[PDB]
């Protein structure tokens, strides 16, 4: 209902955890579990590539279509570009529907 | 046939070099009128001669004005077959699987 492609078996969840490394155990044995651990974190890179299948426009329309454009008028910033403080901001939501087909 | 109407009297003569151009739209790239049940059908009785109906379509509008998504289709912009007297046209079509209409 929100949008997208419903699937019985969507792409699976990737769960990640950094394994616990405990601090020094006491010398005398204790039944209880170890609640003292080393403060720790991890870092890396993810690559996600998707292969998409396209359906090309076959339209026999005469007059020109509507398209999505960046309006030319001058502005303090560039849309879909970084700020002066280094902040990336998307100005407006972009739908998928511009080209037309016959009903 | 050529028609010349002069002084109210009119003579219908035969043009042997004239053409008629006909195409089938196979890719469904045109507004599909037929399924709307409009007149102009082949007469039910085989001895009748019938006029061919005019083609036309509707597009988006706001009231009577045209909205920017409105489309305009030039029918001359399609490949067609030009036929003189002594030419004939044909094509074949296979219906996709449809459930039997139930007559019971």
TrEMBL record, chain B:
It is found in: Virion. Belongs to the parvoviridae capsid protein family. This is Capsid protein VP1. It comes from Adeno-associated virus 9 (AAV9). The lineage of its organism: Viruses, Monodnaviria, Shotokuvirae, Cossaviricota, Quintoviricetes. The gene is cap. The chain holds residues 323 to 426 of 736 of the full protein.
């Amino acid at each position: 209902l929100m949008g997208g492609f419903g699937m019985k078996h969507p792409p699976p969840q990737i769960l990640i955890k950094n394994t616990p490394v405990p601090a020094d155990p006491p010398t005398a044995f204790n039944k209880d579990k170890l609640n003292s651990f080393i403060t720790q974190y991890s870092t890396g890179q993810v690559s996600v590539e998707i292969e998409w299948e396209l359906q090309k426009e076959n339209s026999k329309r005469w007059n020109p279509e509507i398209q999505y454009t960046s309006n030319y008028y001058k502005s303090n910033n560039v849309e879909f570009a970084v700020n002066t403080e280094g902040v990336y901001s998307e100005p407006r939501p972009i739908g998928t529907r511009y080209l037309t087909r016959n009903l | 046939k050529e028609v010349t109407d002069n002084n109210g009297v009119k003579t219908i003569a035969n043009n042997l070099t004239s053409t008629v151009q006909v195409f089938t739209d196979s890719d469904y790239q045109l507004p599909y009128v037929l399924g709307s049940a409009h007149e102009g059908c082949l007469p039910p009785f085989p001895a009748d001669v019938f006029m061919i109906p005019q083609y036309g379509y509707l597009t988006l509008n706001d009231g009577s004005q045209a909205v920017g998504r409105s489309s305009f289709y030039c029918l001359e912009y399609f490949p067609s077959q030009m036929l003189r007297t002594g030419n004939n046209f044909q094509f074949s079509y296979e219906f996709e699987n449809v459930p039997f209409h139930s007559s019971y």
